[PDB]
DNA sequence: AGTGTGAG
DNA sequence: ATCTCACACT
């Protein structure tokens, strides 16, 4: 149960090369054929964003070589890219895998899912028989098959998984799990009965690990992770490369204690990894280490803030007057169309205005932020509102010259009420 | 409460 | 991601 961190049935699904795919539905010469997505950019002919399964094992990677390559463009829009399509087939999407279980939209092209509610419900409606291999066409058990060999491989694992899954004891970890995954194959055929796409996905009992299973095995196969699988899997698994770990707090982890892998955090007593990271961190990393983590899935959905920025690195940096004005009218102008739909779809209105910048040759990610109240969707109004909060921020008195330049502009709305 | 940190 | 958003922290 939760002594053991095997209180939920938790599952992460991530759209196998989304955009590319969002492309690939409309052009369909793209569908089955190296292809990639690419922003006009007068550099290299653009920089790739996307790129197809096909194309990656011709060394094609984001960020050619191919000459078959076809390549699909993103419309711009105000200098920055415009992702409505993607974002209307990521709705799309989630509201298909709403109705199988709820979910937490975790980014433009995955989620995660809470199915333990609906794991107990299907084993109760459920004969309380057997569960065939049949209905785990995709899935993967990691770490089973120890003791054409893509395929096949995974259906011995997974024969010798459902030998050993208990079959009386309905709360049995294992068993959540298994019929967790089947859920989730599910869910993912109807994805792509009705959309066309697909994808990937973890199952185990925490957020942290269904992540990191849900990479183990892509692109259109789904990974189980049990809990007797966490010490093997962790055994090689990069500590930067857990949800939340991937920073300050994962690099100083690897070089306070000079560990390289996560299974080695369990070498370390509780009080050891409090008296060197704190009470809170040290406990969590205690527990994940072990396969324990237990943030919750959360439905709740609207957005506690909407906000657009760009950037102007190195010669592009915003020098004059006129410049931080028109990029501030610019964003201010894709602000209000967004504010304007999310107060005709939620009806709810932003009443404060966040205004960021950096200035060149700043380490921080900000040079500095200041607000105002924001009491009109008038786009003309915000740009002025927050021109003149920032606008005595500058050191050059010299008339129309910016000093020091802006290399970032970052415009905010929040406090909805 | 603004700054800093982290995910995707 | 070579942008949007969340939230922990005296
Ligand atoms: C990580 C990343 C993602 N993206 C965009 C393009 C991807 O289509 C989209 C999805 O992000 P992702 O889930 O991290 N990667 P992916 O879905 O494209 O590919 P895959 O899951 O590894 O097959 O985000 C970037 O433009 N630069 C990036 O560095
Ligand atoms: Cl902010
Ligand atoms: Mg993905
Ligand atoms: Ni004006």
Same mark, same amino acid.
Request: aromatic fraction near 6%; charge should be positive; proline fraction near 4%.
């Given at each position: ?255 306070? %204690? ?80 967004? %504010? ?78």
């Amino acid at each position: 149960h939760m002594a053991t961190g095997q209180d939920r049935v938790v599952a992460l699904v991530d759209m196998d090369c989304f955009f590319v795919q969002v492309e690939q539905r409309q052009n369909p010469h793209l569908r089955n054929k190296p292809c990639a997505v690419v922003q006009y950019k007068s550099w290299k002919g653009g920089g790739i964003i996307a790129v197809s399964y096909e194309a990656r094992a011709f060394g094609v990677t984001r960020s050619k070589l191919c000459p078959d390559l076809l390549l699909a463009q993103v419309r711009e829009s105000r200098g920055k890219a415009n992702l409505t399509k993607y974002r209307e087939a990521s709705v799309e999407v989630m509201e298909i895998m709403s109705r199988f279980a709820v979910i937490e939209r975790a980014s433009i092209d995955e989620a995660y899912v809470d199915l333990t509610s609906a794991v107990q419900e299907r084993l109760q409606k459920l004969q309380g028989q057997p569960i065939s291999a049949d209905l785990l066409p995709s899935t993967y058990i990691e770490g089973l098959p120890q003791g054409v060999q893509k395929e096949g491989m995974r259906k011995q694992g997974l024969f010798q998984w459902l030998d050993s899954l208990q079959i009386d004891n309905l709360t049995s970890p294992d068993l959540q799990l298994t019929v967790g995954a089947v859920i989730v194959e599910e869910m993912r055929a109807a994805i792509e009965r009705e959309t066309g796409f697909q994808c990937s996905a973890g199952i185990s009992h925490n957020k942290v690990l269904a992540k990191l299973a849900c990479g183990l095995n892509k692109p259109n196969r789904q990974t189980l992770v049990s809990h007797g699988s966490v010490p093997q899997l962790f055994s090689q698994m990069p500590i930067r490369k857990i949800r939340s770990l991937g920073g300050k707090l994962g690099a100083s982890v690897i070089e306070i %204690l000079g560990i390289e892998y996560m299974g080695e955090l369990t070498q370390f007593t509780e009080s050891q990894l409090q008296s060197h990271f704190g009470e809170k961190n040290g406990s969590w990393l205690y527990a994940m280490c072990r396969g324990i983590e237990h943030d919750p899935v959360k439905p709740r959905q609207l957005p506690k803030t909407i906000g657009c920025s760009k950037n102007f690195p190195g010669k592009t940096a915003l020098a004059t007057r006129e410049q931080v004005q028109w990029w501030l009218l610019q964003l201010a102008q894709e602000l209000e169309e967004r %504010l304007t739909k999310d107060r005709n779809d939620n009806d709810r209105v932003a009443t404060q205005l966040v205004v960021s910048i950096r200035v060149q040759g700043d380490k921080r990610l900000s040079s500095l932020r200041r607000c105002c109240a924001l009491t009109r969707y008038d786009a003309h109004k915000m740009s002025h509102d927050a021109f003149t909060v920032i606008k005595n921020c500058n050191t050059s008195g010299i008339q129309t010259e910016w000093s020091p330049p802006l290399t970032m502009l970052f415009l905010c709305a929040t406090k909805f009420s």
